[PDB]
Amino acid sequence: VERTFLPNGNYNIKSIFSGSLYLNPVSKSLTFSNESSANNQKWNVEYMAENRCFKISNVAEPNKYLSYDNFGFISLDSLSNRCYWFPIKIAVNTYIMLSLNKVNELDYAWDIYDTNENILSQPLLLLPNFDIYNSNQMFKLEKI
Amino acid sequence: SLNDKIVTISCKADTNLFFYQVAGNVSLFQQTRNYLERWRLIYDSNKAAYKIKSMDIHNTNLVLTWNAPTHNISTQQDSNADNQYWLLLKDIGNNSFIIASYKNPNLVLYADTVARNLKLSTLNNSNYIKFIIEDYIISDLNNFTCKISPILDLNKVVQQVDVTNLNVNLYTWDYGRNQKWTIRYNEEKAAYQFFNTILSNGVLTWIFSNGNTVRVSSSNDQNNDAQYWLINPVSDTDETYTITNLRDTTKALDLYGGQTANGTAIQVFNYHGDDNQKWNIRNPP
Amino acid sequence: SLNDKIVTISCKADTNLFFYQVAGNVSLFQQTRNYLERWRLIYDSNKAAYKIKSMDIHNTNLVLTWNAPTHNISTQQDSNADNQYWLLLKDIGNNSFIIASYKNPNLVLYADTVARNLKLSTLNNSNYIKFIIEDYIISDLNNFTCKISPILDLNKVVQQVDVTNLNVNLYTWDYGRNQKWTIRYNEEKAAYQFFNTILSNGVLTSNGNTVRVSSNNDAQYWLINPVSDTDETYTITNLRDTTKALDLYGGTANGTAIQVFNYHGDDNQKWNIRNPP
Numbered sequence: 001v002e003r004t005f006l007p008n009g010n011y012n013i014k015s016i017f018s019g020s021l022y023l024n025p026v027s028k029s030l031t032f033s034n035e036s037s038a039n040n041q042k043w044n045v046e047y048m049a050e051n052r053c054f055k056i057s058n059v060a061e062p063n064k065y066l067s068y069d070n071f072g073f074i075s076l077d078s079l080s081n082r083c084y085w086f087p088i089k090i091a092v093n094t095y096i097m098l099s100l101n102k103v104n105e106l107d108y109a110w111d112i113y114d115t116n117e118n119i120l121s122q123p124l125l126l127l128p129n130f131d132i133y134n135s136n137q138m139f140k141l142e143k144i
Numbered sequence: 145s146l147n148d149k150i151v152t153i154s155c156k157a158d159t160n161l162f163f164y165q166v167a168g169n170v171s172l173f174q175q176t177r178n179y180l181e182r183w184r185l186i187y188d189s190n191k192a193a194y195k196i197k198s199m200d201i202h203n204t205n206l207v208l209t210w211n212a213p214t215h216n217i218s219t220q221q222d223s224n225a226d227n228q229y230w231l232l233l234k235d236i237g238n239n240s241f242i243i244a245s246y247k248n249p250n251l252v253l254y255a256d257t258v259a260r261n262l263k264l265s266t267l268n269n270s271n272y273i274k275f276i277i278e279d280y281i282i283s284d285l286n287n288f289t290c291k292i293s294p295i296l297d298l299n300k301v302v303q304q305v306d307v308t309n310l311n312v313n314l315y316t317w318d319y320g321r322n323q324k325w326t327i328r329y330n331e332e333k334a335a336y337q338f339f340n341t342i343l344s345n346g347v348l349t350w351i352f353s354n355g356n357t358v359r360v361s362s363s364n365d366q367n368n369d370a371q372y373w374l375i376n377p378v379s380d381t382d383e384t385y386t387i388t389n390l391r392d393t394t395k396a397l398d399l400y401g402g403q404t405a406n407g408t409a410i411q412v413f414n415y416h417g418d419d420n421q422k423w424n425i426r427n428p429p
Numbered sequence: 430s431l432n433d434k435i436v437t438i439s440c441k442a443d444t445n446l447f448f449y450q451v452a453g454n455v456s457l458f459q460q461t462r463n464y465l466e467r468w469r470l471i472y473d474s475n476k477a478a479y480k481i482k483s484m485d486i487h488n489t490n491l492v493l494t495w496n497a498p499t500h501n502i503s504t505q506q507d508s509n510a511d512n513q514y515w516l517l518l519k520d521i522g523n524n525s526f527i528i529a530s531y532k533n534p535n536l537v538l539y540a541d542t543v544a545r546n547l548k549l550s551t552l553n554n555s556n557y558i559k560f561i562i563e564d565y566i567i568s569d570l571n572n573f574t575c576k577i578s579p580i581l582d583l584n585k586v587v588q589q590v591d592v593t594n595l596n597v598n599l600y601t602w603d604y605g606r607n608q609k610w611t612i613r614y615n616e617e618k619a620a621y622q623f624f625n626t627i628l629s630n631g632v633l634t635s636n637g638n639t640v641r642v643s644s645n646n647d648a649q650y651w652l653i654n655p656v657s658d659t660d661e662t663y664t665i666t667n668l669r670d671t672t673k674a675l676d677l678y679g680g681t682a683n684g685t686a687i688q689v690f691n692y693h694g695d696d697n698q699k700w701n702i703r704n705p706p
């Protein structure tokens with residue numbers, strides 16, 4: 001029963017900088033790594049209707065959620081209001097991911113730092129959002 | 145060390161663009177050598193941050209403000225707000241500053257060199273988030289080609305006599321290159337040289353081998369403190385300075401006898417701060 | 430200006446904790462006054478950033494490394510990589526430094542004082558991202574209480590004669606407070622003072638050469654500079670006349686004079702500065 005623009009289910013998560021790099025945890029950080037065809041690159045995306053937001057859990061550790069910590073990193077953790085995400089759909093499969101809650105009284109979003117479009121070994125951070133044009137804040141959700 | 149200093153702020157990405165202010169609007173603009181591009185740094189020890197106050201002469205209470213929640217920058221009435229404070233982080237080795245918002249240090253000032261204005265940004269390794277902060281006097285005088293007139297007669301100038309005769313005297317402005325000087329600031333020494341524009345390497349010099357005599361000589365020498373000068377503004381004036389020598393700062397560049405005739409010697413003399421030791425450094429018209 | 434300087438790095442959030450490294454592990458640890466807390470800053474002028482290299486005598490090629498994408502900071506073999514370069518941002522308010530990764534300048538070093546190690550944070554206003562970087566000599570000598578022994582005779586030391594008597598001579602080591610000196614550094618004067626621990630406000634310092642104690646006086650400040658390939662031996666030169674060096678008139682026997690005398694390379698002008706046992 002679809003309530004919104006992005007159906008419930010399992011997804012791969014990519015940065016627009018690379019069609020071949022895939023979101024997964026490495027230690028306590030999140031990063032984009034070579035295709036593993038493993039469950040830790042698979043993400044369960046679930047709409048929460050009361051909130052109009054999304055929870056995103058890892059298939060390998062189904063009770064851990066994409067959340068954020070007090071040092072500016074995206075994280076994998078137990079359920080809390082930090083696990084709620086407000087996507088903005090800007091193209092086919094392309095989204096900006098805002099924390100539901102205002103942080104430091106601004107919109108904050110997933111942000112991956114790049115070096116001439118290279119993101120290898122970068123952690124996914126939570127940084128301020130101002131508009132829909134920041135290449136570093138654009139991510140693909142692919143169903144599979 | 146930076147509290148209460150009046151400075152220019154320009155872009156590492158484009159050193160010809162300066163923070164420019166008028167009627168609440170901040171933009172990036174060519175050098176003006178005037179108050180539209182001057183800012184007072186005001187330190188708060190508790191916050192450990194600075195306000196950046198415009199030296200606008202009409203609106204006297206304007207400070208660099210982050211227009212949260214946008215990424216825009218303006219000047220607004222100072223209310224001591226957290227969005228009116230900034231961390232001045234000096235990138236050592238790069239002689240440049242990253243300027244972060246105290247309200248939110250995740251965000252720093254970013255020079256849009258094509259739009260010619262400022263915004264807030266997350267960090268990166270580009271020169272677009274790096275700024276050059278400089279004493280406004282140094283900023284104004286460094287690489288400035290000027291004439292130097294005594295305030296007893298502003299129709300006269302300090303000149304080298306010609307390319308081969310290096311003596312320095314007072315004459316009626318005749319627009320010749322022998323009567324123009326380009327000022328350059330040396331940061332290793334915190335002092336200036338005056339290069340006469342009729343030569344490549346000629347600099348205004350105290351001939352400490354001949355008492356008070358002043359002449360132009362080559363810069364081909366290793367290091368001579370006599371070649372270098374301190375330039376200090378006289379209060380209440382836009383273009384008036386006292387010029388003292390690096391070797392011995394009690395020695396001030398001086399017009400002989402406060403005499404205003406053609407030929408009158410320009411020499412150094414013990415600083416008394418009388419009118420004959422005050423100098424107008426100006427644009428050539 | 431900082432390229433190739435050997436420095437200690439300590440925490441503004443806790444000024445008793447210093448960057449410490451052993452065998453690839455970086456931690457926050459109390460003052461050691463030794464190579465384990467000493468780092469060489471190496472400037473790459475093209476990146477406008479710095480390698481921070483441990484002065485470990487056993488493994489000489491280790492540098493501070495962010496184990497991207499993790500939260501962990503360690504020391505690895507220098508391979509000149511992006512995760513081994515740091516932006517040194519001096520906060521002009523505080524005389525502290527923020528140390529940001531060249532690989533990701535949004536991330537800066539964060540002192541976890543509870544766990545006594547380093548992690549990473551985005552920029553904020555906390556002291557946990559602020560660091561004090563100081564020339565290692567200054568770091569070791571500042572607020573250090575020491576005995577001062579000549580290279581000629583270790584078992585003897587420089588002293589104020591008595592609380593009543595401000596004169597200064599050479600005497601055998603007896604652990605008296607008149608034989609001990611608290612070194613304080615003055616940033617403005619870029620130089621040192623020696624407080625004698627018998628007095629509150631008496632320091633080492635018009636009668637030519639002789640050296641005495643008293644309450645501008647540029648002559649009372651000094652410059653300590655080390656001598657190559659030693660741990661604790663130094664020269665001490667006077668601020669009002671840098672030509673001057675601390676001299677042992679003779680030496681070697683008791684009561685021998687300690688005076689001002691023009692600098693020479695000789696062993697009577699080299700002084701061991703140690704912790705009192």
Ligand SMILES: OC[C@H]1O[C@@H](O[C@@H]2[C@@H](CO)O[C@](O)(CO)[C@H]2O)[C@H](O)[C@@H](O)[C@H]1O
Pocket residue numbers: 398399400401402413420
């Ligand atoms: O070495 C030349 C100096 O001439 C002085 O002018 C004299 C002052 C006395 O100092 O009074 C006069 O007698 C005129 O009333 C001058 O002979 C200048 O004041 C010095 O600046 C200096 O140029």
Ligand SMILES: OC[C@H]1O[C@@H](O[C@@H]2[C@@H](CO)O[C@](O)(CO)[C@H]2O)[C@H](O)[C@@H](O)[C@H]1O
Pocket residue numbers: 676677678679680690695697
């Ligand atoms: O002012 C005392 C000085 O005593 C010197 O020792 C003399 C050297 C010459 O410099 O040679 C002697 O004659 C002994 O062979 C000494 O009289 C010290 O070298 C100086 O450091 C100084 O203490």
